[PDB]
């Protein structure tokens, strides 16, 4: 049982490394888009020096109701990952229950 467990966890280590590398490859796939987007955005910010009356996605004029969105890892045994994530989430929602934010 211990030898088969060792073989299985070695297989999961190899598969997890390949999955990490394929996620990195997806990020490098995305980096053309992100670079072109982060340069066109500056091109807009240079043609107009934030001369704007627009974009309802820039209403930071209060902190009335925050929506902390927490992504987490979704499998079994999850390293030591999911507990750390939701722990920081619980600390942050506690701090947002202090201020009275009514967080979703």
């Amino acid at each position: 049982s211990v030898k088969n467990t060792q073989k299985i966890t070695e297989a999961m280590k190899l598969v997890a490394a390949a999955k990490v590398r394929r996620a990195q490859e997806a990020v490098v796939n995305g980096r053309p888009f992100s670079e072109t987007l982060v340069e066109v955005l500056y091109n807009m910010n240079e043609q107009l020096q934030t001369e704007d009356v627009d974009v309802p996605l820039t209403k930071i004029r209060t902190v009335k109701k925050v929506a902390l969105m927490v992504v987490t890892g979704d499998r079994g045994l999850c390293g030591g990952f999911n507990n750390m994530l939701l722990k920081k989430a619980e600390s942050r929602i506690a701090e947002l229950k202090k201020l009275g934010v009514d967080y979703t």
């Binding site: 049982s1 088969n4 966890t9 045994l77």
Partner: protein, 247 residues
């Protein structure tokens, strides 16, 4: 044991009728031989039995044979010493016993009675041309599913039930369904179970296993297959349990 054999051998040599001798704890026929062989002057063998363990055991077991005048079917309740399945007393009787059936404390501690092991219990009557082709195929599929479960017992116990595949998870749930469905309410074990006994034939258990491992009814709860006579009684117990859940 030789007295039982002499009565059976008379009923097979003279009365020309097929007899069914049940010997209980044939391991006593070897252990008493041990206790006398120690004093007798014969040297001790392996773990503590007599030297002529095999020849004495054969002198009992060989006289039980269908001999053209009848047929002595026999079911010896061999005792494995503390489940030492490699000990001389069962190791010599495995050679003589045709349709052996290894009952396991491992599959009894979880309450699955009878404690017969699905894997270890094997018979030389599971050849297809002898037992029926569909029955042989169902037996092969059940044994393979239980073997896959016994091989995934290490992954399940340590790395969690979720860390395996989602087809292999179907095989695990199917193996659970099977290894619970092959429980039986005996008529004589009603005092231990508390529930009445259901005698179920061969074709009915084949028709049950076909629908269980064909994936057609993988929705029933696991306890609905526990201590149940037939697959129709399992379907009825699923309704009973779903009503008792909300009620």
């Amino acid at each position: 044991g030789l007295t039982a054999l002499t009565m059976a051998e008379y009923f097979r040599d003279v009365n020309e009728q097929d007899v069914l001798l049940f010997i209980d704890n044939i391991f006593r026929f070897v252990q008493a031989g041990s206790e006398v062989s120690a004093l007798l002057g014969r040297m001790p063998s392996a773990v503590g039995y007599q030297p002529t363990l095999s020849t004495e055991m054969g002198s009992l077991q060989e006289r039980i044979t269908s001999t053209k005048e009848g047929s002595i079917t026999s079911i010896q309740a061999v005792y494995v010493p503390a489940d030492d399945l490699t000990d001389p007393a069962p190791a010599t009787t495995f050679a003589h016993l045709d349709a052996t059936t290894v009952l396991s404390r491992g599959l009894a501690a979880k309450g699955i009675y009878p404690a017969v092991d699905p894997l270890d219990s094997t018979s030389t009557m599971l050849q297809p041309r002898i037992v029926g082709e569909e029955h042989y195929e169902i037996a092969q599929r059940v044994k393979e599913t239980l073997q896959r479960y016994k091989e995934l017992q290490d992954i399940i116990a340590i790395l969690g039930l979720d860390e395996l595949s989602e087809e292999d998870r179907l095989t695990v749930a199917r193996a659970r369904k099977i290894e619970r469905f092959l429980s039986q309410p005996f008529f004589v074990a009603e005092v231990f179970t508390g529930s009445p006994g259901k005698y179920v034939g061969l074709a009915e258990t084949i028709r049950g296993f076909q629908l269980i491992l064909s994936g057609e009814l993988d929705s029933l709860p696991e306890q609905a297959f526990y201590l149940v006579g037939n697959i129709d009684e399992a379907t009825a117990k699923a309704m009973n349990l779903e009503m008792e859940s909300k009620l």
